[PDB]
Amino acid sequence: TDMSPINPELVQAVQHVVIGPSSLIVHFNEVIGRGHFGCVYHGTLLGKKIHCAVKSLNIGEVSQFLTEGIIMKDFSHPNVLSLLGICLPLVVLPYMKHGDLRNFIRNETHNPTVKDLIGFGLQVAKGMKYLASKKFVHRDLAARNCMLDEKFTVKVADFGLARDMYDKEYYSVHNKTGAKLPVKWMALESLQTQKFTTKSDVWSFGVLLWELMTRGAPPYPDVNTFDITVYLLQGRRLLQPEYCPDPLYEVMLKCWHPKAEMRPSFSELVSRISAIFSTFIGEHYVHVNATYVNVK
Ligand SMILES: Cn1cc(-c2ccc3nnc(C(F)(F)c4ccc5nc(NC(=O)C6CC6)cn5n4)n3c2)cn1
Numbered sequence: 001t002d003m004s005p006i007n008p009e010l011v012q013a014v015q016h017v018v019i020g021p022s023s024l025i026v027h028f029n030e031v032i033g034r035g036h037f038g039c040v041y042h043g044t045l046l047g048k049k050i051h052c053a054v055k056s057l058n059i060g061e062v063s064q065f066l067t068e069g070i071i072m073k074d075f076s077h078p079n080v081l082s083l084l085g086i087c088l089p090l091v092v093l094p095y096m097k098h099g100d101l102r103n104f105i106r107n108e109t110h111n112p113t114v115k116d117l118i119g120f121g122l123q124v125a126k127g128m129k130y131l132a133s134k135k136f137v138h139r140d141l142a143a144r145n146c147m148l149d150e151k152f153t154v155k156v157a158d159f160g161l162a163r164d165m166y167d168k169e170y171y172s173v174h175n176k177t178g179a180k181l182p183v184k185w186m187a188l189e190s191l192q193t194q195k196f197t198t199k200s201d202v203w204s205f206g207v208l209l210w211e212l213m214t215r216g217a218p219p220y221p222d223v224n225t226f227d228i229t230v231y232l233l234q235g236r237r238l239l240q241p242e243y244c245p246d247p248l249y250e251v252m253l254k255c256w257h258p259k260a261e262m263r264p265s266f267s268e269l270v271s272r273i274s275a276i277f278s279t280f281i282g283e284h285y286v287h288v289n290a291t292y293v294n295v296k
């Protein structure tokens with residue numbers, strides 16, 4: 001690549017994931033939202049009742065649905081969206097009061113500080129550190145794909161059975177293979193090979209940090225296709241946001257290192273961002289840039 005600028009066992013194994021039919025109520029008349037692979041609705045998981053989000057998806061596929069459930073049920077971490085269970089093709093997930101992280105930071109009625117937004121970034125880094133330690137490559141880390149609960153705990157989401165194209169604006173079709181890919185978040189090497197690694201997740205995380213400090217501006221306005229590769233190979237990176245501290249921009253530039261192996265691990269990012277976070281006291285209000293308002 002160019003990097004210099006120019007089954008009985010499966011049934012028994014899935015038992016701890018399955019929710020019984022009469023112990024879940026799906027409110028099909030209360031839609032939360034629509035995705036490409038399924039519609040998401042409000043639900044009551046049942047003694048004791050707990051509020052949840054239920055995604056309704058569209059034999060080999062049944063085996064894979066159960067298998068994906070088991071794998072997803074093993075991932076338990078405060079900054080990762082947990083699987084509550086499955087029902088058959090329904091995916092039962094915790095309801096996220098504040099929706100996706102991008103919409104949250106863009107909302108003009110919210111008044112985040114620098115500390116708040118760096119805090120969200122730190123939470124995402126902790127989630128990714130956990131997933132990377134399980135050898136799980138996300139492939140689509142972005143602010144739209146993380147969610148926020150009632151305590152403002154950020155959860156890395158959009159993986160496993162919750163995988164979808166949640167905003168179709170930011171997925172571009174590769175002219176040969178036909179794959180719809182999030183090109184504005186992709187590493188230089190993934191743009192060229194369509195292979196993904198933990199180090200390409202690190203690149204994406206850098207872009208996510210940029211999204212946080214801009215309060216959800218779209219990266220690279222009017223560069224929407226795989227021609228982003230050419231743009232990057234001119235010797236370019238996303239500019240430093242007005243409210244991004246110098247040390248955090250230095251971190252973003254490390255995430256976008258041309259050589260994948262020279263990019264920091266998520267362990268390193270958690271360390272570095274935690275230090276930066278600790279220097280702020282909640283005095284710097286972050287406002288939206290006039291030139292990014294209303295732009296796609
Ligand atoms: C732009 N955008 C991105 C997403 C997105 C991203 C990642 C993701 N991973 N899983 C899901 C889900 F769909 F399964 C799901 C799971 C729990 C949940 N809680 C709410 N609560 C709200 O919407 C409240 C504000 C009202 C919605 N979901 N959606 N994701 C949905 C939706 N839109």
Ligand SMILES: [Cl-]
Pocket residue numbers: 113114115116280281282283284285
């Ligand atoms: Cl602050």
